[PDB]
Design a protein around this ligand. Structure first.
Ligand code: HEM
Length: 82
């Protein structure tokens, strides 16, 4: 299978580096994208844990981003979260 991650497991990644989150039932590791991500390592690290779909969408982001995200996809939201 793909190995989905629970909101909890994703929630464990919210300290300094470990920065995961859920964007439309999809998990994106951006731990090695903090300093890289133009928004500035802050909003990403803060919204880390999950429930950033609205935040991500609120920014809008472009096609390039939408595609990049897929390259950063680590899996999907656990089938026991939804
Ligand atoms: C799925 C992974 C993500 C990728 C690949 C990504 C990529 C990008 C890129 C390329 C930009 C440039 C803006 C543009 O012209 O489109 C950007 C800006 C931005 N992103 Fe992301 N992003 C991701 C996730 C997030 C998340 C989860 C948040 C919310 C916590 C976020 C918040 C922002 C903000 C605040 C900006 C700057 C807008 C501003 O305040 O001026 N991004 N992102």
């Amino acid at each position: 299978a793909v190995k989905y991650y629970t909101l909890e497991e994703i929630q464990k990644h919210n300290n300094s580096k470990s920065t995961w989150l859920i964007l439309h039932y999809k998990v994106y590791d951006l731990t090695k994208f903090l300093e890289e991500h133009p928004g500035g390592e802050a909003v990403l690290r803060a919204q880390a844990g999950g429930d950033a779909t609205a935040n991500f969408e609120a920014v809008g982001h472009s096609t390039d981003a939408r595609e990049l995200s897929k390259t950063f996809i680590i899996g999907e939201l656990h089938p026991d979260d939804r």
